[PDB]
Structures are given as structure tokens and as C-alpha cells.
């Protein structure tokens, strides 16, 4: 367990991993943004 | 001889109807199950269905032109 | 009321596909 | 007799042409009304 | 079929006394074996000594009785060799050996009870499939 | 309207997108709970 | 519900980015 | 006459009870109280002239003797079979689950 | 020049050397029956119709001799297991001979045709060009087809004017050829029912008969000469495959699941008989009736036919043989000489135990008994070492009643055993292994091979059906496409390939 005073914070430090995930997906975003020019 | 997709489905009209269809057919089909009615249509085991509470062999279908009666007779068989 | 054969084709799939979608979504909360 | 199975097979015969007849009716039918220009 | 109030009563001692499990005190007897126990009974049967199993009519001729939740209860404290002639702690999970089989050291007597009653109940449900290893796979 | 392009098509692919992933990720959870679970 | 807030406004969050400077003609 | 003298075996008190001179070790677990601390000495004092013998085990405690005679209904001898006793096969033949 | 795949290709517009080439094809064709039906005599041995019939012996064509009538050899003998019969001209080696004698007749017939191609018959009166005019060919042949199909049906199957054909009782055991009148009520469609293939023949050859004078007589409408290309011989062909790969799929069917022209003393029995327990449950009533009527287990079982008791046994089930299994079936388990007797096995509390049978799915399998209510009483362990169900444990043993054991009983473990593995077979014979060194392992019958040959030629003539129906279709572009992409493009044309919209 996080030590007892970050506990409230245990659902956010649960979805952090896989934001690296998600800057691979914005290049998409992005890409379709500008047209895929 | 017809309108692209893309035209289609970037359109307000497109997204007006589909905003009501979309969610309604996907709501019904959750309801057919939520209901139950999708066991019944179907004539699948729920999970207290598959055996009566002892018994441990399946009900297997042996007859071919009684095979209706036979089920029939194993879904009584579940007290 | 004016329908085309596309319109007919892409409703076969996509109507039944949405209907099943949100079944196998409800089936997901089934407990034995 | 009109045995069990008998009667069965005119129920699949006649559900067939129905399904022929009315496919085939509807196809006549558009195609009357949407014709080729030439 | 179901797992009725029936299924879940099971013998609390060598002398007729029954306990009634709760559906919540079965589940989680299941989820405690699973973590301290199923990495080597998996099953039912004992991948270190596949000799011996965890089938009811084998915990019966143990010595002492094992067949029961008591029993069951005192096994996981002070474990011994089917013959009830020694000890094993050392080589087996149990609160007396809880400093060298770390999961065992929060487990209390609510704990113990469940996991004995996951041992009884299985096989009512399982039949042969408890303890009774790949063939009955 | 009928009128193409007022939704641009990079909106509509990033929430059709997003939509397909909560779908499947439910499907995911599923798998390990309720029937299928094993448990 | 916590686990689906923080990960809808973190997933959000990129996404508004693009839409933002999209709006605003800026140098996407 | 070639014989398999394992099945042949089966056709003896062998194939009935534990026979104190071949029998596995395993087998002894179908009785309370002989596993595995009596089975151990069994195994290791074979063979016996009859299934008596086996109250004459060197080293044996009062409690143990009284256990090995309510088990004496249950246990056989017969001749040692070479193919049952070579390989350490009483101490593991080779089966588990 | 043509590549190697074509070369038959000279005879599309030769209508003489096209018959000539057809002539041939017949020729050899009829000298393979008559050289297949003399290695067959030549093989034969007609000594006995009980235990060793023609489809233990990898008979393909005697079969065929025998269901429609020829059933005697000049030599003496019947496959009905006759002496002194004679057959007339028309035994198996008249039949092999008559088949040469046509060979021989068609080859010079050939050679004729295809010297003197050039016949003033296959010039078009109009432009002197080769034509035939396929669709009147269409009606002549079918009436020629007509009415040989009804004179089959009406002088031969009958006996009215021939020898009838193969009928036996539904056990196959008292198999004779007769003349059999036709069924005209719906069990005429019943394939089981000889009464049927007659009424089929009489019905369908008046048709044909119609049906060509109708194609003699009435020219096809432009409109399907047009869509079929019935000016270009390879649309018959197209069809014609068409129609044979129906007809092969048909035949490899009733040859499988049995039917009034696959009799089982001709093909041997089906699969689904064993499936069935057809014959076990024939003979058990037989053997309960004679019980019934006061007989002993000795006499009940003595009363079974061996030739019964022989349909109860797997290594006659066309569907446990071996792709490359090459040979007879006595090739395999060996020429059966006698019925050992049916075997009852006992435990030691003397109730009667059932050797599990084995399916025509496995190779192998294990040997099991059980009670009359399945429970298991005993077996043959793999590991010996917790073996609770050991013959030996169980103290099995075995009594023979009918055939060569009857009245015995055996005791000892390993010949219990012996017999208990013989049992998952079905009744027990005794086989001769010497003659033919027999390797003890199992082929197909005549019905297997037959069903193998043409559900495979009739699949691959499928595809000769795709193929030609292209060429016929397609002959315009068949050397490549047009050297507009407006065709081939959207939006140019409101209906595709039609340059008038
Ligand atoms: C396509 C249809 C068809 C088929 C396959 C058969 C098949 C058969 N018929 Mg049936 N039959 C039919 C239609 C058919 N019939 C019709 C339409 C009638 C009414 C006319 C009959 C009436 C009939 C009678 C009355 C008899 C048969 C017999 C037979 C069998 C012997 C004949 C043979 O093998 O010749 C094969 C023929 C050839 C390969 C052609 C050879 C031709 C050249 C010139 C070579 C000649 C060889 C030889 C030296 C000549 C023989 C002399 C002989 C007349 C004594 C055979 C199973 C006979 C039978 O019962 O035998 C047991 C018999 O007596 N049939
Ligand atoms: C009273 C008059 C009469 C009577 C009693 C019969 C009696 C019979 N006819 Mg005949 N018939 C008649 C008049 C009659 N016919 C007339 C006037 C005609 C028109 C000329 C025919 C044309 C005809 C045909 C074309 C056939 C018969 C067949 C039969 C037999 C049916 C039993 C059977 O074994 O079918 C077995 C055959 C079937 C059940 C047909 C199967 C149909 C398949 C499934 C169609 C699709 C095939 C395709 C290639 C795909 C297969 C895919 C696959 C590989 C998975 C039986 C002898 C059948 C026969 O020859 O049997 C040996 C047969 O095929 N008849
Ligand atoms: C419909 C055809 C047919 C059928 C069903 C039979 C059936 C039978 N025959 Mg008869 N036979 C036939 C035609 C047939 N024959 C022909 C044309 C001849 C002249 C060669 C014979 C000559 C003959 C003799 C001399 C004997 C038989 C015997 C037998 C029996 C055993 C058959 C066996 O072992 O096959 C074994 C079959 C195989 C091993 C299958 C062969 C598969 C081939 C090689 C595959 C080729 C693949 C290909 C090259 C791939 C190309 C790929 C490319 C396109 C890319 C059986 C009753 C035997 C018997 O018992 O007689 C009393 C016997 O001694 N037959
Ligand atoms: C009645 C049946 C029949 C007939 C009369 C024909 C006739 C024809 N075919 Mg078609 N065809 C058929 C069925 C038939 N085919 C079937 C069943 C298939 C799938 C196997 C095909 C697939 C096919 C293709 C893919 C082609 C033809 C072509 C041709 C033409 C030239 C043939 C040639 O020169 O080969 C010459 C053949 C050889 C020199 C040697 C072939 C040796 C084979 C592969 C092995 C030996 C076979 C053995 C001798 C025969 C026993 C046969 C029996 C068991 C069936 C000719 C019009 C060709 C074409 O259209 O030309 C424009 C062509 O390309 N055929
Ligand atoms: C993959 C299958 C297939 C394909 C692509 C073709 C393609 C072709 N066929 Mg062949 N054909 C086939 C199978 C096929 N055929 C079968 C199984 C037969 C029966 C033996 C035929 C008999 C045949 C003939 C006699 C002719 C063709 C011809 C043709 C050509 C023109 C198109 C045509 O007539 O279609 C035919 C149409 C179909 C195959 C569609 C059939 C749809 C049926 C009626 C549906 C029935 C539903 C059924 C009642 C449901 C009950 C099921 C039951 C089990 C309960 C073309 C090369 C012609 C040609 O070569 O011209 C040069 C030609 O003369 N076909
Ligand atoms: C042609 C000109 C020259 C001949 C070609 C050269 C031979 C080529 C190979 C022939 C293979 C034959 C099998 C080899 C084994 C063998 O000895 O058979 C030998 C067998 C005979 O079998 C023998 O029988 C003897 C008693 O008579 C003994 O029992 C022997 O032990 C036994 O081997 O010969 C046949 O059975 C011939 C006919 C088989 C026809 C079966 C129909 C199956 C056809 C479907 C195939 C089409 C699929 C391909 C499409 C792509
Ligand atoms: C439950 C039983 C099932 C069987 C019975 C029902 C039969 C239905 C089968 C018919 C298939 C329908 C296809 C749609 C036809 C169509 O939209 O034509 C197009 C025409 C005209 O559109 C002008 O535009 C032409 C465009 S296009 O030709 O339609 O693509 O339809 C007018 O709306
Ligand atoms: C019972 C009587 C039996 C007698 C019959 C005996 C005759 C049988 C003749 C068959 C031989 C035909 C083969 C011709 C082969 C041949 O000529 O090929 C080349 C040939 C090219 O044809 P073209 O149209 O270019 O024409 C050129 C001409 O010169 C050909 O005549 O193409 C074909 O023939 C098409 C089908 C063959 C494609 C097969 C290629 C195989 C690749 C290798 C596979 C093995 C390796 C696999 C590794 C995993
Ligand atoms: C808390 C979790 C565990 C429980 C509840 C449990 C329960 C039991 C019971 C009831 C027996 C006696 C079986 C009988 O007499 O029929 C036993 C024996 C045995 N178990 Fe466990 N056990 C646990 C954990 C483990 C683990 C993790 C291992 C592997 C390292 C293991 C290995 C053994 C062995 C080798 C025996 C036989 C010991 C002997 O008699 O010599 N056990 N267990
Ligand atoms: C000339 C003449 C003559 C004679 C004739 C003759 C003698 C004939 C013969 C003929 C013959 C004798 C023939 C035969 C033929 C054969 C064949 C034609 C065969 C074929 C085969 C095949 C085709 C096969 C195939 C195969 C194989 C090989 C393997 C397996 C698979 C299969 C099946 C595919 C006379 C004197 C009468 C008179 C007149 C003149
Ligand atoms: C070239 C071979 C000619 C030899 C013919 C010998 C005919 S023999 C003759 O054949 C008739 C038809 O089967 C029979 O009815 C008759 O009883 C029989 O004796
Ligand atoms: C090419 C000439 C050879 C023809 C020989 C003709 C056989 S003729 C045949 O002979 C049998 C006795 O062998 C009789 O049973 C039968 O009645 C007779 O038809
Ligand atoms: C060998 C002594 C015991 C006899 C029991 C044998 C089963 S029966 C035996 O089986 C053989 C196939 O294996 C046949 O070839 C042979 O004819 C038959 O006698
Ligand atoms: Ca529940
Ligand atoms: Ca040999
Ligand atoms: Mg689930």
C-alpha cells in the first residue's frame, strides 16, 4: 500500500501507468487534426 | 451515384437521428437480457438451470423424433 | 420515403450489431 | 393420412415460395418504378 | 442447482455438531485458499505429496479426525503427518510457522474457519473432481 | 442539414475511437468477473 | 466511479488540447 | 508359459489387501493411523513368514503394535516379486494423481 | 504450337475425329471391365458364399455382374453357392467376353472415324462448315436414353423379358436375383425398396421418351440458345459434367447408407449398421425367442446362422480401414474360416459382464465389462500398481455357446483376456492368417472403396464443371481482354458492361 496519508489518491496512482499510452493515441488525434497532410 | 459516407456521418442530420437510434437499439438489447426474456427466446440454461440440485449428468438429447418431448421432460426434471 | 440498396446493406448489419453490443455490455454484470 | 411430417414439409414448401414469391414481387415492382433512361 | 444452506452445513466436530456456512463465509474461505493454500492444493490434491489429498473420507482417517472444522481449524495452527505423530509447522503453512509463511500471519480464528469450510464444501459441489487430480479434469 | 463536414471527421473518429475502447474494455473486465470468471 | 473520473478526465484531456488549438487556428 | 508376474499377482491376496512384502507405500493410507510412521518400518523390516510378523518390527512403541493388530485384517503376504520391490518401487512406483 | 494441357483441343470443330476419340474412350473403357472382370475370375474363389463372399476377396466388378443377374460361372458354379448350375452364354465369363469382343469392335470403329473424318454428315448444308446442331442431337439421344431406360425397367427388372435383379431379406442373408414388380405408391420412393428402381424405370424412360420427341421436335428459344452458347459444343460438356458429378455424389450416397442397389452380400454391410447394433439386435431376438420357446443357451446360440453372426463383427464394417491398406479384406484379419461361438463372460460371483464394443472411430481401445446397467465389473488395467477391476480380481471367465467352442468354458486369466479383446470386435471368428500372410490389420470393402472413389472423382468434376462453364461463357476473352476505361469505371454507365445507358 502508498503510505496511509496518500491513500485518498489510490484510484489516480491505478490509472497512471497507462498514460504513456495515451501520448501514442494523441499522435493520432493530432494527425487526423491536421489531415494526416 | 451517391452521397460519401464522410459527408454523411459529419453531418448534424446524420447525428440528430443517430443520436436517439444508437442509444435506443442498444438499450433494447441490453434489456433483452437484463429482463431475462433473452433465456427464454433462446431455451439457454440461466446458472441455476444446467442441472436439478443433485444430479451431476448432463441432459443429453439420444432421440431424434422425440428429441422435443425429451427436453421438454429434462426442464420438468428441475424440480 | 426514399431508400437506397446502401442504406438497405449498411442497416442489416449495423441495426442488429448495436442491439447486440448492448446485450453482450448487460451480460458483462451476470453473476452465477 | 397427412402425416405429421407430411404436413410440415407443405408449411416449409409454401413458406419457401412465399419468401421467393414476395422477393421477386418486390424486385419486379422497384424496378418499374426505377428505370433505366437511354 | 444452487448453493443452498443445505450444501454449505458441515460438520463442526468429530461429534455430530454441524455449522451452517453464510454464502459470504464460503466465497471467501475460496479466496483465502486460493492465496495461501492453492499454490500446492490446488484442486484438492497436494503437488508436494500427491499421496495425500484434500478429499473428505481422507481428512475422516487422519489422525487426529480431520473431517471437520475443528479439526480443520487445529490442522492450520499445528500441522501433522496423517498419522497425527509429528509436527510439521516447519515444513508446513500454519500460525505456528506464520514467522516462515508470511500469508499465514494475519489470518484469525474467522479466517481459518472459512478456508476449513471451503475444504468440506468443495467436494459436495466437485464430487471425484476434488482431490482427484488431471484425470477428472 | 444534410450538410457534410459540420462535425469535423477527426471529432467523430477520436469519440467513435473512445467508444470502441470502453466497449472492449468492458468486455475485458467481464472476463473477469461475473460468468467466465472462473470464481 | 473514482477509478472511471480520473481516468475520463485524464483521457480528456488530450484530446481538448488538440480541440482547443484547433479552435483557436494555433500551430497544430 | 511366459507370464506377466504382475498381473498374475492381482490374482493373489496381493490383489485384495496390502501385502506387507510388495505392496506400495502408498497403500497404507487407506487406514487410520499407518502412514507414515508405520509404513516407514513395515517397508524397511520386510518380508515377513506371516502377517503376525509384523508385530515383532525392532523398535516398535506399545501404542504401535495395538494399531498394527486392529490392521491385521487388512494386510497379506505373499513372495517377494522382484518386479514390484526393485527400483525403490515401494517407496514410489512411479504413480501420483 | 498448343501446350500440353490442350492438345485435345484439335477436336472441338472435327465432329468425326471428336467420335472417333469417343470411340476410342469406350473401347477402353469396356476393355478395362471385361480385363478386370477376368482378374477377378482369375482371384475368385467361389467356395464359400457363407464366411468368405466376394466383398472379403476385394471383388469390385462381380458385384456389379451379380445385381443384375449374372450369378453363374461356366465352370459350375453360383455365388448363391450352388453346383451344377448352368448359367447359359451369359456367366461371369461370357459377360468379361462380350465386354472384350466390344472393345475390339469400337476400336476399329474408331479407326474408321478417324481416316474418314471428313463425312459430308458434319458439313452445315448452308456454309459447308463442320457444325453440329446440338440441340435436335439433345432429343435423339434422350430418346434413345428413354427408351432403353423403360425397356430396362419393363423386360429386364421384371423378368417379364430377363433375369430381374438382386433382392435379399433385410438381414441379407437369403440374397437371390428376381424379377421385381414396380412399386407405384409412394414407397416407390423409399430407396430400400427394390419395387422402386423399377417403377423408376418404367416412369422415367416414358419421360425421356416425351422429353426427346419434345427435343426432336420443338428449337430452342433464341433467347436460351443465345444465353447458352448451344452453338458451342463445350456448353455441353459444361452441363454434362454437371449432371455426372450429380450422378456420382448420388451413387458414393446409397453405396454409404445402403439402399435396394447396394446389397450388403454384394458390397458387404454399412457403417451404421455397426453404429445400429443392427445385427446384434437381430440375433439377440432370435437367440431370446428360442429361449422362450424352451431352448438352451446351447441350442439358442447353435440356431444363429454363421453368416449372421458374421454381419456382427467390425472387421466387416466398411469404415475401419487404411487409406493404403491395399487389398481384400481378408488381406487384413485373414480369411474367416468359422464362428467361435458367442462368448459370455462371468465374474466370480457368476453375473453375466459386456465387453464395452468398439467404435469405427479408434484404432484401438480399451477392454472393458460392465453390468447389464453399465456399471464397470472388470477390465484390463494399463498401470497394474491400484488396479481394482483386473480379470484376475474379479475372477472373469468365459463360455462359448454356438460354434466351434460351443459348450466350453475357460478360466484361466490370459486366454479370459484373449477373448475379452476379440469381443470389442463383435462376435469371434477364426480367421486363416497363412494363406495370404494376413497382418492382422483392418481394410475397407468394396462399399468403402466405391464410396471413396466417387465422392472424390465427383468433387474433382465439380471443378471440371466451373472450368468449362467458363470457357463456354467467357470464349470471347478467353486470350486476353479487349486491348474504354469507362466500362470498367463508376458513374460512366447507369448499368454495368451496358454501353447503351
Ligand atoms: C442398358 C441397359 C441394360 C443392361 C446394362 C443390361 C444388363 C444385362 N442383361 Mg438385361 N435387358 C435390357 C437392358 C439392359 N440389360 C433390355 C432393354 C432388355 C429387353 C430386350 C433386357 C433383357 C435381357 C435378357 C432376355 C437377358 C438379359 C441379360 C443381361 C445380363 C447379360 C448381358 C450382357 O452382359 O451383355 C453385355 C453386352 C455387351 C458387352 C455387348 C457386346 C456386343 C458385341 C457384338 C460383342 C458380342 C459378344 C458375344 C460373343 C455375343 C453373345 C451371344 C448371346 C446372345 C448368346 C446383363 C446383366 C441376360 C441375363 O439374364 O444373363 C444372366 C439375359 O438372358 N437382359
Ligand atoms: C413413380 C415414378 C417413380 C419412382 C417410384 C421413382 C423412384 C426413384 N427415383 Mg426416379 N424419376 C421419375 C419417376 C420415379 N422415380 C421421373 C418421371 C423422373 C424424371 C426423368 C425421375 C428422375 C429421378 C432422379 C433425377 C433421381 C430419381 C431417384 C429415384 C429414387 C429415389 C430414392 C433414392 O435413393 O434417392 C437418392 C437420391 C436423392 C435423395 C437425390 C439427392 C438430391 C441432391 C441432394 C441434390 C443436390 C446435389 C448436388 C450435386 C450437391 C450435393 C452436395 C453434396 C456433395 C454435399 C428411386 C429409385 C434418385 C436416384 O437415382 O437415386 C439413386 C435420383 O437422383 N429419379
Ligand atoms: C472407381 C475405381 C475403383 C475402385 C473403387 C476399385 C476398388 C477395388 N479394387 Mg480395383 N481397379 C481399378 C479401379 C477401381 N478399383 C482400375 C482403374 C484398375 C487398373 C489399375 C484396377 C485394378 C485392380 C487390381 C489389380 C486389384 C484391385 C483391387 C481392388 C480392391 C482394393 C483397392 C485398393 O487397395 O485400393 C488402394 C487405393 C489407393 C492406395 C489410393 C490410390 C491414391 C492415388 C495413388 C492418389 C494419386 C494422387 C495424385 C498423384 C496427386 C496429384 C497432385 C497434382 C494434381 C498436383 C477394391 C475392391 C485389389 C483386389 O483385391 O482385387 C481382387 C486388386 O488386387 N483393382
Ligand atoms: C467428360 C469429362 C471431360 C472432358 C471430355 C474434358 C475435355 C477437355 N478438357 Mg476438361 N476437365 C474435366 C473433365 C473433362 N474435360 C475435369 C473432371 C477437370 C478437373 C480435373 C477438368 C479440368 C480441365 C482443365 C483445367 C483444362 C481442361 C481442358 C480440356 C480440353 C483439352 C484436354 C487436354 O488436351 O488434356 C490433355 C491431357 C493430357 C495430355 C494428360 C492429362 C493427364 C492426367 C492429369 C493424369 C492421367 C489421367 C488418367 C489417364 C485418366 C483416367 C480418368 C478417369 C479416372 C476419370 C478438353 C476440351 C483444357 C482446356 O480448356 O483447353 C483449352 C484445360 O486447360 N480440363
Ligand atoms: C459453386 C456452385 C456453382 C457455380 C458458381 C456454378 C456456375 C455455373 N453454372 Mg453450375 N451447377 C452447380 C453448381 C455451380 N455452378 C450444381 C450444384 C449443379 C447441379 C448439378 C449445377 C448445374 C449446372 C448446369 C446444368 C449448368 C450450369 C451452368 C453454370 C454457369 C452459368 C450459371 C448457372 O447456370 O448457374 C446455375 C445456378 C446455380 C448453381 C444456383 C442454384 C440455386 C438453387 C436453385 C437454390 C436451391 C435452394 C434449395 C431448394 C434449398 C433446399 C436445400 C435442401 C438441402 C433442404 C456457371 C459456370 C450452365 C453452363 O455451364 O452454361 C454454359 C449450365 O448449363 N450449372
Ligand atoms: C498408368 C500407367 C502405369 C501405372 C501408373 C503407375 C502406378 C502409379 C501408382 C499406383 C498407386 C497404387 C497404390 C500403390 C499401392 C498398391 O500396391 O496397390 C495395390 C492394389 C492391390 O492390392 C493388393 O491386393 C493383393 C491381392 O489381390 C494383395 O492383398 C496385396 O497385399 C495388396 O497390396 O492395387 C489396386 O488396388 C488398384 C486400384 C485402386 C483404385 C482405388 C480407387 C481410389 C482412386 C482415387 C484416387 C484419385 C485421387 C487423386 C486425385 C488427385
Ligand atoms: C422477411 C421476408 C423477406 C423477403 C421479402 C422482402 C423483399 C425485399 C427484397 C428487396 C431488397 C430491397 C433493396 C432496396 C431497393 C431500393 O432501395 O431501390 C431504390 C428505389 C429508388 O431509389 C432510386 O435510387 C436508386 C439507387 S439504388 O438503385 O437503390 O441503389 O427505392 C425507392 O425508395
Ligand atoms: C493411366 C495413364 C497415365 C498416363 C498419364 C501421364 C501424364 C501426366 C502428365 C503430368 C505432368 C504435367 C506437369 C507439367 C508442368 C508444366 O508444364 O508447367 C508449366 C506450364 C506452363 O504452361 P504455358 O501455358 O506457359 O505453356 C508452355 C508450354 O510449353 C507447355 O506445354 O504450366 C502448366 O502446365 C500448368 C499447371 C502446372 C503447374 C505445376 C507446377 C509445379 C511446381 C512444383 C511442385 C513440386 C514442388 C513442391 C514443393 C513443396
Ligand atoms: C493455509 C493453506 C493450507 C491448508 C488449509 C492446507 C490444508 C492441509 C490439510 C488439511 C492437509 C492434510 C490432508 C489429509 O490429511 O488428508 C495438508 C497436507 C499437506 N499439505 Fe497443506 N494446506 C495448506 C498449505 C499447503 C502448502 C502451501 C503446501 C506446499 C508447500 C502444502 C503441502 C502439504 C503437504 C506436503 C501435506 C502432507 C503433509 C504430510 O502429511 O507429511 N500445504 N494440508
Ligand atoms: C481389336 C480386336 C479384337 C480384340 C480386342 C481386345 C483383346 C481388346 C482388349 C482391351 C483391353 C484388355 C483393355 C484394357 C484397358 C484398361 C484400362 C483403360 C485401364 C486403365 C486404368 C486406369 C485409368 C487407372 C488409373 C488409376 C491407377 C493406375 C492407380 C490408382 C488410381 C487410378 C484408379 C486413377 C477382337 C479379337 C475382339 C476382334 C475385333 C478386333
Ligand atoms: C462367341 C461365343 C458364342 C458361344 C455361344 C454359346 C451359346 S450357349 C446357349 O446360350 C443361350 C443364351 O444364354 C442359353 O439360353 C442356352 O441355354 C445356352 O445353351
Ligand atoms: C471365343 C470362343 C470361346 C467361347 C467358349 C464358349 C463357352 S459356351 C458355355 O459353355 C459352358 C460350359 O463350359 C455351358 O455351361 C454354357 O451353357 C455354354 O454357353
Ligand atoms: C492364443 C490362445 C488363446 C486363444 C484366444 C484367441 C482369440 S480368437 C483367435 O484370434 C486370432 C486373432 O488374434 C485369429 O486369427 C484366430 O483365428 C483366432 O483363433
Ligand atoms: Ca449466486
Ligand atoms: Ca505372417
Ligand atoms: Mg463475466
Known sequence: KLPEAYAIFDPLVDVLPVIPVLFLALAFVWQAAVGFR | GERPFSDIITSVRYWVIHSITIPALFIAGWLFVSTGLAYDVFGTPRPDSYYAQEQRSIPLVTDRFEAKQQVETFLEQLK | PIFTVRWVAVHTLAVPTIFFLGAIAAMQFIQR | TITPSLKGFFIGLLSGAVVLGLTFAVLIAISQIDKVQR | ???????????????????????????????????????????????????????????????????????????????????????????????????????????????????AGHILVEPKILGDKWGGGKVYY | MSEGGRIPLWIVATVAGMGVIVIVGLFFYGAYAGLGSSL | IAQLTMIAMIGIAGPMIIFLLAVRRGNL | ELVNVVDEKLGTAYGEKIDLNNTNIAAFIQYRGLYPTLAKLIVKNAPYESVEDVLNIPGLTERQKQILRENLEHFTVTEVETALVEGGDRYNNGLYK | ?????????????????????????????????????????????????????????????????????????????????????????????????????????????????????????????????????????????????????????????????????????????????????????????????????????????????????????????????????????????????????????????????????????????????????????????????????????????????????????????????????????????????????????????????????????????????????????????????????????????????????????????????????????????????????????????????????????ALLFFFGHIWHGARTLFRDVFSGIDPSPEQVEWGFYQKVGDVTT
Open chain 9, 1 to 457: 504450337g498448343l501446350p500440353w494441357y490442350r492438345v485435345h483441343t484439335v477436336l472441338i470443330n472435327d465432329p468425326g475425329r471428336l467420335i472417333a476419340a469417343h470411340l476410342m474412350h469406350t473401347a477402353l473403357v469396356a476393355g478395362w471391365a471385361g480385363s478386370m472382370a477376368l482378374y477377378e475370375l482369375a482371384t475368385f474363389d467361389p467356395s464359400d458364399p457363407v464366411l468368405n463372399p466376394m466383398w472379403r476377396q476385394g471383388m469390385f466388378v462381380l458385384p456389379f455382374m451379380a445385381r443384375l443377374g449374372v450369378t453363374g460361372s461356366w465352370s459350375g458354379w453360383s455365388i448363391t453357392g450352388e453346383t451344377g448350375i448352368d448359367p447359359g452364354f451369359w456367366s461371369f465369363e461370357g459377360v468379361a467376353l462380350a465386354h472384350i469382343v466390344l472393345s475390339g469392335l469400337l476400336f476399329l470403329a474408331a479407326c474408321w472415324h478417324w481416316v474418314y473424318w471428313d463425312l459430308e454428315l458434319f458439313r452445315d448444308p448452308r456454309t459447308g462448315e463442320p457444325a453440329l446442331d446440338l440441340p435436335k442431337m439433345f432429343g435423339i439421344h434422350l430418346f434413345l436414353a428413354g427408351l432403353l431406360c423403360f425397356g430396362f425397367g419393363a423386360f429386364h427388372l421384371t423378368g417379364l423379358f430377363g433375369p430381374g435383379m438382386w433382392v435379399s431379406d433385410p438381414y441379407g442373408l437369403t440374397g437371390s436375383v428376381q424379377p421385381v414388380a414396380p412399386e407405384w405408391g409412394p414407397d416407390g420412393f423409399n430407396p430400400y425398396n427394390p419395387g422402386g428402381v423399377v417403377a423408376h424405370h418404367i416412369a422415367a424412360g416414358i419421360v425421356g421418351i416425351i422429353a426427346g420427341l419434345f427435343h426432336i421436335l420443338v428449337r430452342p428459344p433464341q433467347r436460351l440458345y443465345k444465353a447458352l452458347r448451344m452453338g458451342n459444343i463445350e456448353t455441353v460438356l459444361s452441363s454434362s459434367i454437371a449432371a455426372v458429378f450429380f450422378a456420382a455424389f448420388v451413387v458414393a450416397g446409397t453405396m454409404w447408407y445402403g439402399s435396394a442397389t447396394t446389397p450388403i452380400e454384394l458390397f458387404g454391410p454399412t457403417r451404421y449398421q455397426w453404429d445400429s447394433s443392427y445385427f446384434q439386435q437381430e440375433i439377440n431376438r432370435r437367440v431370446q425367442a428360442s429361449l422362450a420357446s424352451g431352448a438352451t443357451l446351447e441350442e439358442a446360440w447353435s440356431a444363429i446362422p454363421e453368416k449372421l453372426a458374421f454381419y456382427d463383427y467390425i472387421g466387416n464394417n466398411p469404415a475401419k480401414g487404411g487409406l493404403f491398406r491395399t487389398g481384400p479384406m481378408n488381406k487384413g484379419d485373414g480369411i474367416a474360416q468359422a464362428w467361435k461361438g458367442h462368448a459370455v463372460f462371468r465374474n466370480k460371483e457368476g453375473e453375466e459382464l459386456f465387453v464395452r464394443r468398439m467404435p469405427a472411430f479408434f484404432e484401438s481401445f480399451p477392454v472393458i465389462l460392465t453390468d447389464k446397467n453399465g456399471v464397470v465389473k472388470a477390465d484390463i488395467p494399463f498401470r497394474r500398481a491400484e488396479s481394482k477391476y483386473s480379470f484376475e480380481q474379479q475372477g472373469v471367465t468365459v463360455s462359448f455357446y454356438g460354434g466351434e467352442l460351443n459348450g466350453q468354458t475357460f478360466t484361466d486369466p490370459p486366454t479370459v483376456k484373449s477373448y475379452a479383446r476379440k469381443a470389442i470386435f463383435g462376435e469371434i471368428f477364426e480367421f486363416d492368417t497363412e494363406t495370404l500372410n494376413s497382418d492382422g490389420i483392418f481394410r475397407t470393402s468394396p462399399r468403402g472403396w466405391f464410396t471413396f472413389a466417387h465422392a472424390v472423382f
Open chain 5, 1 to 115: 442447482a444452487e448453493l443452498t444452506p443445505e450444501v454449505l452445513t458441515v460438520p463442526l466436530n468429530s461429534e455430530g455438531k454441524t455449522i451452517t456456512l453464510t454464502e459470504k463465509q464460503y466465497l471467501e474461505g475460496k479466496r483465502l485458499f486460493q492465496y495461501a493454500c492453492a499454490s500446492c492444493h490446488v484442486g484438492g490434491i497436494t503437488k508436494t505429496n500427491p499421496s495425500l489429498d484434500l478429499r473428505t473420507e481422507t481428512l475422516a482417517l487422519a489422525t487426529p479426525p480431520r473431517d471437520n472444522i475443528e479439526g480443520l481449524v487445529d490442522y492450520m495452527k499445528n500441522p501433522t503427518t496423517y498419522d497425527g505423530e509429528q509436527e510439521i509447522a516447519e515444513v508446513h503453512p500454519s500460525l505456528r510457522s506464520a514467522d516462515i509463511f508470511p500469508k499465514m500471519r494475519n489470518l484469525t480464528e474467522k479466517d481459518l474457519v472459512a478456508i
